[PDB]
Amino acid sequence: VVVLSFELLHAPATVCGPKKSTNLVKNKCVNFNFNG
Amino acid sequence: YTNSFTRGVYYPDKVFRSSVLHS
Protein backbone atom coordinates (compact mmCIF):
# COMPACT_ATOMS: atom_id res chain seq x y z
CA VAL A 1 0.00 0.00 0.00
CA VAL A 2 1.53 3.27 -1.20
CA VAL A 3 0.31 6.58 0.20
CA LEU A 4 1.08 9.87 -1.55
CA SER A 5 0.92 13.16 0.37
CA PHE A 6 1.10 16.58 -1.29
CA GLU A 7 1.89 20.05 0.06
CA LEU A 8 0.50 23.26 -1.44
CA LEU A 9 1.84 26.83 -1.15
CA HIS A 10 4.55 25.94 1.39
CA ALA A 11 7.26 26.81 -1.15
CA PRO A 12 7.73 27.21 -4.93
CA ALA A 13 6.32 24.11 -6.59
CA THR A 14 9.09 21.64 -7.41
CA VAL A 15 7.08 18.59 -8.55
CA CYS A 16 4.64 19.09 -11.42
CA GLY A 17 2.66 17.02 -13.87
CA PRO A 18 3.51 17.01 -17.55
CA LYS A 19 1.68 19.87 -19.25
CA LYS A 20 3.22 21.72 -22.18
CA SER A 21 3.86 25.37 -21.40
CA THR A 22 3.30 28.23 -23.85
CA ASN A 23 4.69 31.73 -24.27
CA LEU A 24 3.01 34.38 -22.12
CA VAL A 25 1.28 37.28 -23.85
CA LYS A 26 0.95 40.66 -22.14
CA ASN A 27 -1.60 43.52 -22.12
CA LYS A 28 -4.51 41.25 -23.19
CA CYS A 29 -7.05 39.61 -20.89
CA VAL A 30 -6.02 35.95 -21.02
CA ASN A 31 -6.32 32.84 -18.90
CA PHE A 32 -3.20 32.31 -16.79
CA ASN A 33 -2.15 29.05 -15.13
CA PHE A 34 1.12 29.72 -13.33
CA ASN A 35 2.55 26.76 -11.42
CA GLY A 36 -0.95 25.38 -10.95
CA TYR B 1 20.86 37.83 30.00
CA THR B 2 19.97 40.99 28.12
CA ASN B 3 16.81 42.46 26.59
CA SER B 4 16.17 42.20 22.85
CA PHE B 5 14.55 45.53 22.03
CA THR B 6 12.81 44.74 18.73
CA ARG B 7 15.04 42.08 17.16
CA GLY B 8 13.80 38.86 15.62
CA VAL B 9 11.24 40.16 13.11
CA TYR B 10 11.22 38.15 9.89
CA TYR B 11 8.98 37.63 6.88
CA PRO B 12 6.47 34.97 7.99
CA ASP B 13 5.69 33.67 4.50
CA LYS B 14 7.07 33.87 0.97
CA VAL B 15 3.95 35.74 -0.16
CA PHE B 16 4.70 39.37 -0.96
CA ARG B 17 2.77 42.31 0.47
CA SER B 18 3.32 46.05 0.34
CA SER B 19 1.94 49.18 2.03
CA VAL B 20 -0.47 47.11 4.13
CA LEU B 21 -0.75 45.98 7.74
CA HIS B 22 -1.02 42.21 8.12
CA SER B 23 -1.85 40.24 11.26
JSON list of C-alpha atoms in Angstrom, two decimals:
[
{"chain": "A", "resi": 1, "resn": "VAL", "atom": "CA", "xyz": [0.00, 0.00, 0.00]},
{"chain": "A", "resi": 2, "resn": "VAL", "atom": "CA", "xyz": [1.53, 3.27, -1.20]},
{"chain": "A", "resi": 3, "resn": "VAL", "atom": "CA", "xyz": [0.31, 6.58, 0.20]},
{"chain": "A", "resi": 4, "resn": "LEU", "atom": "CA", "xyz": [1.08, 9.87, -1.55]},
{"chain": "A", "resi": 5, "resn": "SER", "atom": "CA", "xyz": [0.92, 13.16, 0.37]},
{"chain": "A", "resi": 6, "resn": "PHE", "atom": "CA", "xyz": [1.10, 16.58, -1.29]},
{"chain": "A", "resi": 7, "resn": "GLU", "atom": "CA", "xyz": [1.89, 20.05, 0.06]},
{"chain": "A", "resi": 8, "resn": "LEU", "atom": "CA", "xyz": [0.50, 23.26, -1.44]},
{"chain": "A", "resi": 9, "resn": "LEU", "atom": "CA", "xyz": [1.84, 26.83, -1.15]},
{"chain": "A", "resi": 10, "resn": "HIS", "atom": "CA", "xyz": [4.55, 25.94, 1.39]},
{"chain": "A", "resi": 11, "resn": "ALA", "atom": "CA", "xyz": [7.26, 26.81, -1.15]},
{"chain": "A", "resi": 12, "resn": "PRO", "atom": "CA", "xyz": [7.73, 27.21, -4.93]},
{"chain": "A", "resi": 13, "resn": "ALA", "atom": "CA", "xyz": [6.32, 24.11, -6.59]},
{"chain": "A", "resi": 14, "resn": "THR", "atom": "CA", "xyz": [9.09, 21.64, -7.41]},
{"chain": "A", "resi": 15, "resn": "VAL", "atom": "CA", "xyz": [7.08, 18.59, -8.55]},
{"chain": "A", "resi": 16, "resn": "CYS", "atom": "CA", "xyz": [4.64, 19.09, -11.42]},
{"chain": "A", "resi": 17, "resn": "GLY", "atom": "CA", "xyz": [2.66, 17.02, -13.87]},
{"chain": "A", "resi": 18, "resn": "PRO", "atom": "CA", "xyz": [3.51, 17.01, -17.55]},
{"chain": "A", "resi": 19, "resn": "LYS", "atom": "CA", "xyz": [1.68, 19.87, -19.25]},
{"chain": "A", "resi": 20, "resn": "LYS", "atom": "CA", "xyz": [3.22, 21.72, -22.18]},
{"chain": "A", "resi": 21, "resn": "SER", "atom": "CA", "xyz": [3.86, 25.37, -21.40]},
{"chain": "A", "resi": 22, "resn": "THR", "atom": "CA", "xyz": [3.30, 28.23, -23.85]},
{"chain": "A", "resi": 23, "resn": "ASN", "atom": "CA", "xyz": [4.69, 31.73, -24.27]},
{"chain": "A", "resi": 24, "resn": "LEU", "atom": "CA", "xyz": [3.01, 34.38, -22.12]},
{"chain": "A", "resi": 25, "resn": "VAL", "atom": "CA", "xyz": [1.28, 37.28, -23.85]},
{"chain": "A", "resi": 26, "resn": "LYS", "atom": "CA", "xyz": [0.95, 40.66, -22.14]},
{"chain": "A", "resi": 27, "resn": "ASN", "atom": "CA", "xyz": [-1.60, 43.52, -22.12]},
{"chain": "A", "resi": 28, "resn": "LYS", "atom": "CA", "xyz": [-4.51, 41.25, -23.19]},
{"chain": "A", "resi": 29, "resn": "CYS", "atom": "CA", "xyz": [-7.05, 39.61, -20.89]},
{"chain": "A", "resi": 30, "resn": "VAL", "atom": "CA", "xyz": [-6.02, 35.95, -21.02]},
{"chain": "A", "resi": 31, "resn": "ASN", "atom": "CA", "xyz": [-6.32, 32.84, -18.90]},
{"chain": "A", "resi": 32, "resn": "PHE", "atom": "CA", "xyz": [-3.20, 32.31, -16.79]},
{"chain": "A", "resi": 33, "resn": "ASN", "atom": "CA", "xyz": [-2.15, 29.05, -15.13]},
{"chain": "A", "resi": 34, "resn": "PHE", "atom": "CA", "xyz": [1.12, 29.72, -13.33]},
{"chain": "A", "resi": 35, "resn": "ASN", "atom": "CA", "xyz": [2.55, 26.76, -11.42]},
{"chain": "A", "resi": 36, "resn": "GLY", "atom": "CA", "xyz": [-0.95, 25.38, -10.95]},
{"chain": "B", "resi": 1, "resn": "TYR", "atom": "CA", "xyz": [20.86, 37.83, 30.00]},
{"chain": "B", "resi": 2, "resn": "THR", "atom": "CA", "xyz": [19.97, 40.99, 28.12]},
{"chain": "B", "resi": 3, "resn": "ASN", "atom": "CA", "xyz": [16.81, 42.46, 26.59]},
{"chain": "B", "resi": 4, "resn": "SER", "atom": "CA", "xyz": [16.17, 42.20, 22.85]},
{"chain": "B", "resi": 5, "resn": "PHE", "atom": "CA", "xyz": [14.55, 45.53, 22.03]},
{"chain": "B", "resi": 6, "resn": "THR", "atom": "CA", "xyz": [12.81, 44.74, 18.73]},
{"chain": "B", "resi": 7, "resn": "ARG", "atom": "CA", "xyz": [15.04, 42.08, 17.16]},
{"chain": "B", "resi": 8, "resn": "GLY", "atom": "CA", "xyz": [13.80, 38.86, 15.62]},
{"chain": "B", "resi": 9, "resn": "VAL", "atom": "CA", "xyz": [11.24, 40.16, 13.11]},
{"chain": "B", "resi": 10, "resn": "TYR", "atom": "CA", "xyz": [11.22, 38.15, 9.89]},
{"chain": "B", "resi": 11, "resn": "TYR", "atom": "CA", "xyz": [8.98, 37.63, 6.88]},
{"chain": "B", "resi": 12, "resn": "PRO", "atom": "CA", "xyz": [6.47, 34.97, 7.99]},
{"chain": "B", "resi": 13, "resn": "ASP", "atom": "CA", "xyz": [5.69, 33.67, 4.50]},
{"chain": "B", "resi": 14, "resn": "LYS", "atom": "CA", "xyz": [7.07, 33.87, 0.97]},
{"chain": "B", "resi": 15, "resn": "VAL", "atom": "CA", "xyz": [3.95, 35.74, -0.16]},
{"chain": "B", "resi": 16, "resn": "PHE", "atom": "CA", "xyz": [4.70, 39.37, -0.96]},
{"chain": "B", "resi": 17, "resn": "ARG", "atom": "CA", "xyz": [2.77, 42.31, 0.47]},
{"chain": "B", "resi": 18, "resn": "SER", "atom": "CA", "xyz": [3.32, 46.05, 0.34]},
{"chain": "B", "resi": 19, "resn": "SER", "atom": "CA", "xyz": [1.94, 49.18, 2.03]},
{"chain": "B", "resi": 20, "resn": "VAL", "atom": "CA", "xyz": [-0.47, 47.11, 4.13]},
{"chain": "B", "resi": 21, "resn": "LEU", "atom": "CA", "xyz": [-0.75, 45.98, 7.74]},
{"chain": "B", "resi": 22, "resn": "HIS", "atom": "CA", "xyz": [-1.02, 42.21, 8.12]},
{"chain": "B", "resi": 23, "resn": "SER", "atom": "CA", "xyz": [-1.85, 40.24, 11.26]}
]
